[PDB]
Amino acid sequence: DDDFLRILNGIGKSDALVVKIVDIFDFNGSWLPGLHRFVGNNKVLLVGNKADLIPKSVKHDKVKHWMRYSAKQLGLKPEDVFLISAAKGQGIAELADAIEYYRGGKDVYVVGCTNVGKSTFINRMIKEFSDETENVITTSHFPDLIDIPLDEESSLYDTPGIINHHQMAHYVGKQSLKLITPTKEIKPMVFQLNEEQTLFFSGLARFDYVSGGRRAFTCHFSNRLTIHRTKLEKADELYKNHAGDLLSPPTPEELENMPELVKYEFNIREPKTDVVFSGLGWVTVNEPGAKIVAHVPKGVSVSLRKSLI
């Protein structure tokens, strides 16, 4: 896309600070691939939004470490990493302080995938900087987006939200998306499963515990998401007949316009390990030796990380 390339090069040519917002519950789904090569000369702040949804047991220091590590794997080395709740306000004041410090008197560009919370964050920034300057907000066209004065000589620029065609939220509608997203702090639900058992996180993803005897699994998902538990040999049959009805989301219409569910295998060899379904939630495995087969639509990310508790 010619449009997005032009702005990336423009931002790269400037000495501006880049603020990249990601959804902490959809880290890989909301990642902007390639951004790192265009803003290599620029200082970047990586901002993880929706911190209010993080369970109390999860440590923010470990979340930031995981964000920093994950960004590094994908070629981005941010100056620093921040956790915020644009909705509730947590971390906003500190981030505003950091933006002022790191920008070094230059402009700032805010970038993000759709639904990460960029509009909500931009609203927080307008408030944070409102009492600071005599210049007023202006709108400007992409070759109306907001330009927020930081002082009389520099501004913070909102940029058009990017559509990631492969993230989970791209395959669901408004009514459907409401069920998958947590409205409040995620409450960790403790499961005790035997070998050859299956968990369906609605009709969008599957978790197969294929080998390792009897174990405990802590699931972290939206309270509006329905988790269906079956025997492994019954899982295939249930999905072929009840997806779109019982195993919904997705709806029958969304099922037809969605990539086919693809499998991935994992073998955990260390204690406290999360199976992370981007855009959905995560399953914690306290003990090593578990053999797991995760199912996710073609394109959507599922990965492993060390627990953040």
Ligand SMILES: Nc1nc2c(ncn2[C@H]2C[C@H](O)[C@@H](COP(=O)(O)OP(=O)(O)O)O2)c(=O)[nH]1
């Ligand atoms: N729980 C939680 N939800 C949030 C937060 N910030 C934004 N949201 C919600 C509000 C919207 O329903 C949805 C998308 O927000 P938005 O600001 O319109 O995102 P964007 O498409 O402009 O990137 O996410 C936040 O900090 N916490």
